[PDB]
Every structure is written in C-alpha cells, then in structure tokens.
Write a structure and sequence with these properties.
- This protein is of the alpha/beta class and 213 residues long.
- Helices cover 37% and strands 22% of the residues.
- The longest helix has 23 residues.
- It binds one DNA strand of 99 nucleotides through α6.
Length: 213
DNA sequence: CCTTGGCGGTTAAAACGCGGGGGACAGCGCGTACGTGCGTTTAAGCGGTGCTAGAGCTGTCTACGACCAATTGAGCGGCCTCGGCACCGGGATTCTGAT
C-alpha cells in the first residue's frame, strides 16, 4: 500500500541524488547507480518496513577527469535527514560535521521545510558549502526532460576564452538565476558559466552561454 | 507597492515524573542526673548607730559662640580618554562515583 509508494518515491529521489552527484563530476560506483527498488528496500527498510534515512547518507569523491577539469572540486557529503522540519539545531549539527571532516560541499536533503532561522546558517559556514534540496523536488530528474537541454559548466580557462572571443564583460552575457532548477541541480556558484547546446530548427545546432548572475 | 495584523521559530527559564537513596520517626534497650526529700548551717534581712562625699544650689566673672557684612577657590557640573576584566575560546586539574 502507501508504504510501497513512500519507499518507491524515496528510492527515486535517491537515484536522482546519485545522478546529480555523478553529473557534477563525483565518482559513483556503477553498482550503486543501478540500485533497484527491492534491493534498496532490502538495504534500507526495517522489519516493520519503514526506512532508515541514515544509511543513504554516502560520501562521494571527485572522478579524476572532473579533477583535471574542475580543479576546485573537493569532497562531497550527501545526507538524507530524518527530521521533517529542520531547525537551527539540525543545521548547527550538519555544519559542525561538514567542517569537522573538511567536506567541501554538503547536500542536505529534507522532507517538509527548512526554517529561515536555520536557512541563515547555509551561507555563513565558509569555506565549506551547504546546499539543500527538498525530497518532493527530487523525485523526477528534470535534466531528463525533453525541454531541458544539457547544461555543462565551463572551467575557468574556457570561461576566459569565451569572454575574450566575444570581447565581453561578465554582465553582458545572458544570465541564469542561482535558484534556477538546473543551476540548483548543478551547484553553480556566482560567476560560473554553463554552456547549453540545444536543438535549432534553422541551423540544426546552436550553442548558448549563460553566466550565473 | 505600501501599511498593518496574525501564527511559527527560537531563547531562556521553569513544573512533572521516574527511579532512587538515605533520613526523620518510632521503638527498644541502657545509663546516670537530678528532683524530692532529709539533716545541717550561715549570711541576707531588720533594725539601729554613727560618719561623711559630694551634687544641688547659689553666686560671680567672662569669653566663645550667634549674627552680620565682605571675600574667593576648591566644590560641582559637564565632557574626554583609556585599561581591568566578563565573557569567550581552549587545555590542564580534580573530585566522583562505580568497580
């Protein structure tokens, strides 16, 4: 019944999180990619069937290609929290643990809401980075949608090459919001440029560039 | 877009409760201090007898204090500056209890 639906949605969200991490450049084992609903239920659920969200929390390391390309790519921590509402307490613990093991980026997937008082600790936890996603948002991977073309973040050298080829300043580029679902999915920081190749009915293929604010 | 009125979120201080451990209470038993009494004694009290030191009173002389002009500088009000430590971050000491 509804327990099956909850478990299935959670498994879909976990698969989306792993696809997000692999897309961003971290190495994920090919076997944990193909995690199936029943095998996930075996490794996560209980005798009563309700799931322990504390076992999904994993650790991701940069693939060597995404290290040679994105030199600023550190080590990733991904946590599925158990408290539906998340307050300043839980964010304090999460930030303490992230800084405690010098994790560069900490993804904090929550269920119901993250309160503004807690929300204020997200930017004040330098040099680590904390991002949050809601589980309801992660059920579908939106980069698989047909209307969403593939976004690829540029490296610093290629961004410089792009700016010099067009004799451009950063403010004279098309823009993408930091809160954009595909910028949010990609972990774009201010000043970084994605490249968006897309279908063109007049030319076949067209490359677009946006800078994240 | 500007103005104002709710329900949450977070801080901070405070009852309920659950185990829990020890302490006032009551009882039992033992010890000896003192009330009650008896035998013996002398110093406080009554009543005199006498001797005397000094405070109340009076008197006399007076000088420091009350009162009233003049005088002036430290006391008082308003600012200006800077270091001891309450609190914070972090490590070494030390009870403290179960074993």
């Amino acid at each position: 019944e509804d327990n099956n639906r909850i478990i299935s949605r959670l498994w879909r969200s976990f698969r989306t999180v792993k696809e997000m991490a692999a897309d961003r450049g971290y190495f994920i084992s090919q076997e944990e990619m193909d995690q199936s609903l029943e095998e996930f239920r075996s490794k996560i659920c209980d005798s009563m069937g309700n799931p322990q969200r504390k076992l999904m929390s994993f650790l991701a390391n940069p693939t060597p290609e995404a290290l040679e390309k994105y030199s600023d790519l550190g080590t990733l921590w991904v946590e599925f929290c158990d408290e539906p509402s998340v307050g300043i307490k839980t964010m304090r613990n999460f930030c303490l643990r992230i800084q405690e093991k010098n994790f560069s980026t900490g993804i904090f997937i929550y269920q119901n809401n993250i309160t503004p008082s807690a929300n204020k600790m997200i930017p004040t936890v330098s040099p680590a980075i904390i991002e949050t996603f809601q589980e309801s948002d992660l059920v579908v991977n939106i980069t698989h949608h047909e209307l969403v073309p593939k976004h690829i973040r540029l490296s610093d050298g290629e961004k410089s090459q792009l700016l010099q080829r067009y004799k451009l300043k950063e403010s004279q580029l098309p823009r993408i919001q930091r809160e954009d679902p595909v910028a949010r999915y990609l972990g774009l920081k201010r000043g970084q440029v994605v490249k968006i190749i897309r279908r063109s009915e007049t030319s076949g293929r067209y490359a677009s560039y946006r800078i994240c604010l």
